[PDB]
Amino acid sequence: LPILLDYWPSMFGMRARVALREKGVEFEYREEDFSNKSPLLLQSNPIHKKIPVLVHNGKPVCESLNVVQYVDEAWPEKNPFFPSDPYGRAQARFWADFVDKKFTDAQFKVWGKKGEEQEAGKKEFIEAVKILESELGDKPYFGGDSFGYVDISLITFSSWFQAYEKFGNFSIESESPKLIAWAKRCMEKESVSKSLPDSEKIVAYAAEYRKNNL
Amino acid sequence: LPILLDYWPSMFGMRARVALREKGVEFEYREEDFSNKSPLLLQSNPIHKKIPVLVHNGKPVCESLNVVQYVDEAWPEKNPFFPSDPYGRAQARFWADFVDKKFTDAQFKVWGKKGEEQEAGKKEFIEAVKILESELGDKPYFGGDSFGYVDISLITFSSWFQAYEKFGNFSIESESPKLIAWAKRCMEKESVSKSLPDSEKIVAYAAEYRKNNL
Amino acid sequence: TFDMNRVIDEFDEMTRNAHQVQKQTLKEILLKNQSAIYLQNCGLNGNATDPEEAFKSMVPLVTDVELEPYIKRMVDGDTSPILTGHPVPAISLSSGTSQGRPKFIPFTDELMENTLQLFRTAFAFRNRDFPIDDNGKALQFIFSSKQYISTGGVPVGTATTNVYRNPNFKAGMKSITSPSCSPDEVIFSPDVHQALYCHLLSGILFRDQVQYVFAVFAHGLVHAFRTFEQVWEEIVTDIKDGVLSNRITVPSVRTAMSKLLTPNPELAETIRTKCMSLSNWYGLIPALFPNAKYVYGIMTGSMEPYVPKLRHYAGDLPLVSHDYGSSEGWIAANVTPRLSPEEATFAVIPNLGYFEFLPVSETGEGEEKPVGLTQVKIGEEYEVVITNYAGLYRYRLGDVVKVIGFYNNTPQLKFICRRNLILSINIDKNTERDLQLSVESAAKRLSEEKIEVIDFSSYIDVSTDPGHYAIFWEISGETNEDVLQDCCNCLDRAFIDAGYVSSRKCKTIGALELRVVAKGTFRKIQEHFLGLGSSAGQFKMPRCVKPSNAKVLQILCENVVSSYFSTAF
Numbered sequence A, B: 001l002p003i004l005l006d007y008w009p010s011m012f013g014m015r016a017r018v019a020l021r022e023k024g025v026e027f028e029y030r031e032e033d034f035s036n037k038s039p040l041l042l043q044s045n046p047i048h049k050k051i052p053v054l055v056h057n058g059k060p061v062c063e064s065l066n067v068v069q070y071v072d073e074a075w076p077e078k079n080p081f082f083p084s085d086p087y088g089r090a091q092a093r094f095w096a097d098f099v100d101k102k103f104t105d106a107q108f109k110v111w112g113k114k115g116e117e118q119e120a121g122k123k124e125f126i127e128a129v130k131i132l133e134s135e136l137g138d139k140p141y142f143g144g145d146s147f148g149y150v151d152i153s154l155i156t157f158s159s160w161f162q163a164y165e166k167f168g169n170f171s172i173e174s175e176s177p178k179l180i181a182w183a184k185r186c187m188e189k190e191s192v193s194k195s196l197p198d199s200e201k202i203v204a205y206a207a208e209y210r211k212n213n214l
Numbered sequence C: 001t002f003d004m005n006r007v008i009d010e011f012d013e014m015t016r017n018a019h020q021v022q023k024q025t026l027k028e029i030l031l032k033n034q035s036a037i038y039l040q041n042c043g044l045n046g047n048a049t050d051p052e053e054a055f056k057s058m059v060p061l062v063t064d065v066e067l068e069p070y071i072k073r074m075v076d077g078d079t080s081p082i083l084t085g086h087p088v089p090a091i092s093l094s095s096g097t098s099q100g101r102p103k104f105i106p107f108t109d110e111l112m113e114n115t116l117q118l119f120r121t122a123f124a125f126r127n128r129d130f131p132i133d134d135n136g137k138a139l140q141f142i143f144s145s146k147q148y149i150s151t152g153g154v155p156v157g158t159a160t161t162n163v164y165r166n167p168n169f170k171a172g173m174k175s176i177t178s179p180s181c182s183p184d185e186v187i188f189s190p191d192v193h194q195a196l197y198c199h200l201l202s203g204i205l206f207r208d209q210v211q212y213v214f215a216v217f218a219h220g221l222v223h224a225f226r227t228f229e230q231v232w233e234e235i236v237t238d239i240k241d242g243v244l245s246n247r248i249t250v251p252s253v254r255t256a257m258s259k260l261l262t263p264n265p266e267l268a269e270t271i272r273t274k275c276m277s278l279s280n281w282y283g284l285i286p287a288l289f290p291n292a293k294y295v296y297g298i299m300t301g302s303m304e305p306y307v308p309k310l311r312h313y314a315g316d317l318p319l320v321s322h323d324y325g326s327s328e329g330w331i332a333a334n335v336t337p338r339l340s341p342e343e344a345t346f347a348v349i350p351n352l353g354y355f356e357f358l359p360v361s362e363t364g365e366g367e368e369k370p371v372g373l374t375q376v377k378i379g380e381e382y383e384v385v386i387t388n389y390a391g392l393y394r395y396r397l398g399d400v401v402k403v404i405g406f407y408n409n410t411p412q413l414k415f416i417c418r419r420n421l422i423l424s425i426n427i428d429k430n431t432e433r434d435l436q437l438s439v440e441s442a443a444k445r446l447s448e449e450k451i452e453v454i455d456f457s458s459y460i461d462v463s464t465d466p467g468h469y470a471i472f473w474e475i476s477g478e479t480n481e482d483v484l485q486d487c488c489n490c491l492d493r494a495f496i497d498a499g500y501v502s503s504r505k506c507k508t509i510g511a512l513e514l515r516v517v518a519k520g521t522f523r524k525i526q527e528h529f530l531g532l533g534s535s536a537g538q539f540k541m542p543r544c545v546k547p548s549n550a551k552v553l554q555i556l557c558e559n560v561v562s563s564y565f566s567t568a569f
């Protein structure tokens, strides 16, 4: 039985939970105290000391996209995250990297910052969601005919749409409903319905991380 | 015929050239004047406007690591950069991510900036080169039993080592020798022995960047 | 940017690139959509080395009935993306019926793109044949005042509204048309009958520079000129004393017209001095604006019996034919507008979609597989098949069109049909006879005012507890509320069956909401219909709405000239 070392509010760890739940794997959950990081955590990832960390067959997988991909490659028999050809996986990767960096940094500015970066962050976030909206052209999901790799990549930010909608004071729905709506399509599956915790917890927590430092 | 949009001092562009040349493709290279990003380039990636860009079937493939895995998936019959197992692949991806984060930034600080920023950069790169040294341990390479993925990812930074040594006025070899050492071992591959420009010119580019921003 | 030569050259190349561009269009659609659930059940993933072959051999044909559930899954509460992809910002409805039931079709920003580019090219070409002055204007009896929010907080939409109130519309059409006569607020006025009492009045407001008269249909111009013909002594009185008629009651448009008005009396002498000099209106369009280059509208198909009166209205002024496409699919653009309406043919712009044609060549219809766009044979009539940005993948619209000729490498089509008709039994009835009868019985209370009913529809609202029906009516003029309430009552009073009785007598389904509609909305329905990309069989207007009817639905909520719940019951 595989081990997951993650954070209940962490989006990336959530990507991992969504993947392991999406396929059909019983797996055990472990919460990591960043203050008191577990021994297996120190041994598995002594450098970055980051999450999610998936110990499988005695060997751990670190980073979110890495754990997810590891999942797709390890048990590729049921619901594949990737399309059959190299170029499709390519679209999934280009967009995944888009989701994890520029998109993630912009949202980071939104929930975790004040003043200039919050407004600029608002702009970056909106243009980002519309470019992501545009590339998608009109895809119900992301990576393939069903649940995708990049689907996994951005779904966990749908648990964070509320915090941005309140902190960023924007409505990512009225200005781009199709994306949040994409998320409420994905919410009908039990993988995200059970991997990602309540939104209110995340907006409140984000407010608390704001409370803790200035 | 694959078209590569490349930049002479692009360690990333080098990641692409090293990747394709490593596998066994005959390709053409186009030097970019980022002052004048090419019409096909601005069509390949109209927002990032960044190289390396590998054009196959009239489809632009972007991002360096992305481009090398693209290389692996494009001709999967001869030279793989990955081993057979999902975990090994995960390790390779993990360490490649390692290469892209603190390491690249650290070098960027060591040759691009000075003073208060610089020493932070120097301790960070020595730390990185050290962890690097530790994970290398014994393997001829990194990503497999032979020439690997991440080998492609990090070999290209070895032509900048000269610059890091001079501006740093350091010697990365005494603190961590097996790395640069490994690099000149990897230099024997025709993939990197013909894709990477002279280090004196690179040092000179660092000199230009430095002389401009003091 | 809208110019003349470079774009027509690009369109020429585009119609020469036909196979490539249509192919790229398909690739664009699947690359933008490798995620569709219907496609999974079809076996797709993009790329492939037999992509066109695999698409034409593995994804089956579908009807309105089968496309209903998925887009329905998209629209209501479950703002879930399915057939196309993104829960589209607006949903559209289809003429004819889906077993008498409504049909939902996704609308994309790509569609706004299809519109801008087609209008761009066609306008350039007509300007090539009928050039206009860049400081003048055009009489456009165009409308899009209604905007509805569906059962999930998601807008559903008609091509018209989705286009005019669209964010880039004002920015997009600034270079391709002659500036609008009416203020947008008058166009978007909550009362389109009186609102564009104000249209005749606005286009008429700048006649000397009105370079052309516009309605997308011949009939559009016909009832617009029977309605143009429905206000003179009054328009004159309203504009003369500087005080608009008591006919007008909405505060925004009243504010607009009053904003425009000042009392002027000599001009009156003028309007009558000209007007009836002719033997009762031959050359009426030139009479009202002498210098409009043309009368531009859909002249074939169902407008075939309306072209004569319009011609009979437009006199010697040439009558120019319209391009074809919709919220469901875009096909052909007319780049030779100088061709009279009977012979008129329209060439297909290739990137607007991926179309295929089923031959009627055997007997009726004929068990023959679809052939390529240029694989179609000249002179033959085929059935249109749509693969576009609107949720139609290898979908059968159900209309018949003939290949007259080829504009270079892209074929010319022709329409002689009318209805996409083989109906089936419904569930938004209340027998169509019962509905038509309701309108008839309730309408006489309005007929007391020297008027005849022109059109109608209805809608089932299950948002409300209990649910309640909402009946829609298109009539000739403005009247008081009391008669309308009585009308609503009679609407309820004419649904002759016992079932209704059990329901509202109890109230498991709430009292009817009569949102009486202003003139021209149903006209907007026919207008958004015959121009849809397929063939002229696009006029059976669905009479009542099951959650899955959208174009009249977008044309449902905002322009409630009045909306009332029966004070009886």
Ligand SMILES: N[C@@H](CCC(=O)N[C@@H](CS)C(=O)NCC(=O)O)C(=O)O
Pocket (backbone or CB within 6 Å): A007, A010, A011, A012, A013, A034, A048, A049, A050, A051, A052, A063, A064, A065, A100
């Ligand atoms: N690229 C990584 C980023 C992981 C990361 O930084 N995670 C946070 C937890 S959300 C962390 O490990 N922080 C370490 C710390 O708080 O010191 C991923 O996508 O998983």
Ligand SMILES: N[C@@H](CCC(=O)N[C@@H](CS)C(=O)NCC(=O)O)C(=O)O
Pocket (backbone or CB within 6 Å): B007, B009, B010, B012, B034, B035, B049, B050, B051, B052, B062, B063, B064, B065
């Ligand atoms: N993370 C990127 C790094 C690429 C990069 O640094 N590209 C530089 C080459 S110096 C570039 O294209 N800069 C474009 C510009 O700023 O004009 C990758 O590996 O693709």
Ligand SMILES: CC/C=C\C[C@H]1C(=O)CC[C@@H]1CC(=O)O
Pocket (backbone or CB within 6 Å): C114, C115, C116, C117, C118, C119, C216, C322, C323, C324, C325, C326, C530, C531, C532, C533
């Ligand atoms: C690109 C044209 C979009 C606008 C469409 C409507 C008009 O305003 C002209 C008629 C046209 C209906 C049609 O092309 O089917």
Ligand SMILES: CC(C)C[C@H](N)C(=O)O
Pocket (backbone or CB within 6 Å): C115, C158, C159, C160, C161, C163, C216, C524, C527, C528, C529, C531
């Ligand atoms: C797209 C709009 C300008 C017109 C469209 N044919 C409609 O009536 O809905």
Ligand SMILES: [Mg+2]
Pocket (backbone or CB within 6 Å): C143, C160, C216, C523, C524, C527, C528
């Ligand atoms: Mg219309």
